[PDB]
From a paper:
This distribution is regulated by two Wzz proteins in S. flexneri: WzzBSF, which confers an average modal chain-length of 10–17 Oag repeat units (short (S)-type), and WzzpHS2, which confers a very long (VL-type) modal chain-length of > 90 Oag repeat units. They contain a hydrophilic periplasmic polypeptide segment, and two trans-membrane (TM) regions at the N- and C-terminal ends.
Site-directed and in-frame insertion mutagenesis studies of WzzBSF revealed that mutations in the TM or periplasmic regions can influence the Oag modal chain-lengths. Some WzzBSF mutants display shortened or lengthened Oag modal chain-length distribution, while other mutants display no change in Oag modal chain-length distribution or completely inactivate WzzBSF. The residue 107 is located in a helix in the base-domain of the protein, close to the trans-membrane regions. A107P confers a shortened Oag chain-length to bacteria and leads to a loss of resistance to colicin E2. Binding analyses reveal positive cooperativity for the interaction of very-short (VS) core-plus-Oag polysaccharide (COPS) with the periplasmic domain of WzzBSF, and a decreased COPS-binding affinity for the A107P mutant. The crystal structure of the mutant protein shows only subtle structural differences near the mutation, compared to the wild-type protein. Our observations suggest that a single amino-acid substitution on the inner surface of the periplasmic domain can lead to significant effects on the regulation on Oag modal chain-length, and implicates the LPS-binding affinity as an important parameter in the mechanism of this process.
Numbering used by the authors:
A (entry chain C): 4 to 57, 68 to 240
B (entry chain B): 5 to 241
C (entry chain A): 4 to 163, 171 to 240
The structure:
């Protein structure tokens, strides 16, 4: 005795995908895939996983149309065939959800690393620049004292450079040395952006986003008669 | 006995203009091309329709309803067919099943639009927030630099500006503005405007425009008739 | 009795399409569809219209047999159209007439499509001008606030080309007060892109359907004259 249960599935909705898509935009920004590309990626991952299970069937519902897909199972009873089809759909859904959990955490790790490497480099540079400028201020103070330049001798600010700092006068130069510790670090234009981007990536968690690789057009049927 | 046929294809750019405008407003450059939306909409209609051939067959008295491409190896247009008992009945039931699907798809589209609006808003609010944090951190750095320069201006005992010509001031040349102007910059720290990229203003306005979107305003069509359900002049075979 | 006339049609060639592709590039710029995508769009619209005729010609008092099929086993294009006539001259004549009839309906559909695309391209360029206008206003609004802040610093000492938020006060309170009157009446400053968008909108207004010689198909094989009846 043979009973066939049928279901029609298609790509998941933007609502079902919103969390993964948001996570992808937080990690990749403009380089993140379009919502429609993610939908196609997921139903493809689901279809390929179903096809490699390896009696069930997976075929396009309309000839020459990629979507939707008709899934079928031949059981011993109408209730069993329906049950087993829904179970196999859930089983595939979970395998795809697991391979999505891995890929996202790998992308988060790649994201975190590149951003921490970028911040570290910019921090080292900003400190080395502060350190050099301090040595330059220390050197300029010796020149200002020799030359008896106590008050600033600046007419145009452009005149003041890393090599003409003594023009600021020994009084202000001493103050700059005395107050070195509280002199702020100056970072490359994107530092703060990079640091905020990293904070937002750390806020991501797969458990928050309940992602689905498919959507039901028609749930598994209860066959009225046998084949 | 009697077959009623209809031919349906993707909606026209005119029929889709509203949904495409809503999509453009939500995603900007990331929005799908007009031709991709047309395929998505006929895709959503045909997918919903494909449940009916299966459901109508799994009845006590099975009904025959078909959805196939009109020309072999061509995705569009699609031929929808219904086998009825009478000519008037076959036509009536085909049009009813097309209307039934049309209603379900309109509801799916209403939910889709609000889901996309929610996603678009999240992305734009995340963008504005980030940009605001950056602009504040940049302002905060400048105030710290002014605070440091005020200590130098006081030690050098320079109260009035010391400079005639000045393009820009640096950490080392700020004290030349004098302790009087530097104190004023600190006392008014709060009212110093934040400086944002031109993208910021685009993003903020784009968020305002998303809030203006309403489903009832957009007359959306998921298909276009090539041929409405026929009235068969004679029975089959 | 029965005579079969056959024709093979396919997508329009790159020369037949040059004008429609030139109009689409005026409307969408770089966002305009690839020439091969336009070809498929035009043949798609022709074959869709044609696909009604087999059904409608059969559902007549006196049924007529017209068929559309792909000419090549696993190819979308070209398409083979067949008509069964009563006479040899008639089958061929009626096939060519039905191809012309579809060609006329599709030309009307294309005229409506061009105006729908012109409306969409208009909307996108007018939306672009409006955001550039919002940005230019927000920039003007920020500049007035920066000068207002600098005026507070100037009032704490000063009275009398490239300036910053920190060096504006050096222009003196007198000059700064004047700017709050001047810059507030000073017209908006837009990117050269703004005037270019206005130019692209002017070029869309110059588009006319009668100017572009539009073809939705191309003959591979014109309707045949059958040698002997069915
Ligand atoms: Cl002084
Ligand atoms: Mg910013």
């Amino acid at each position: 005795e043979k009973w066939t249960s049928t279901a029609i599935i298609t790509q998941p909705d933007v609502g079902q995908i919103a969390g993964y898509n948001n996570a992808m935009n937080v990690i990749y920004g403009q380089a993140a895939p379009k919502v429609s590309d993610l939908q196609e990626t997921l139903i493809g991952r689901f279809s390929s996983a179903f096809s490699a299970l390896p009696k069930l069937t997976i075929e396009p519902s309309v000839k020459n149309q990629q979507l939707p897909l008709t899934v079928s199972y031949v059981g011993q009873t109408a209730e069993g065939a329906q049950m087993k089809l829904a179970q196999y759909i859930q089983q595939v859904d979970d395998k795809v959800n697991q391979e999505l959990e891995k890929d996202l955490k790998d992308n988060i790790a790649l994201g975190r690393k590149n951003l921490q490497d970028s911040l570290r480099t910019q921090e080292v540079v900003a400190q080395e620049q502060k350190d050099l400028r301090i040595r330059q201020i220390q050197e300029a103070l010796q020149y200002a004292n020799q030359a008896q330049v106590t008050k600033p001798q600046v007419q145009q600010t452009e005149d003041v450079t890393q090599d003409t700092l003594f023009l600021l006068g020994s009084e202000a130069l001493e103050s700059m040395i005395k107050h070195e510790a509280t002199r702020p670090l100056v970072f490359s234009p994107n530092y703060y952006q990079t640091r905020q981007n990293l904070l937002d990536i750390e806020k991501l968690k797969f458990d928050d986003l309940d992602i689905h690789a498919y959507r039901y057009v028609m749930k598994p049927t209860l066959p009225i008669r046998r084949d």
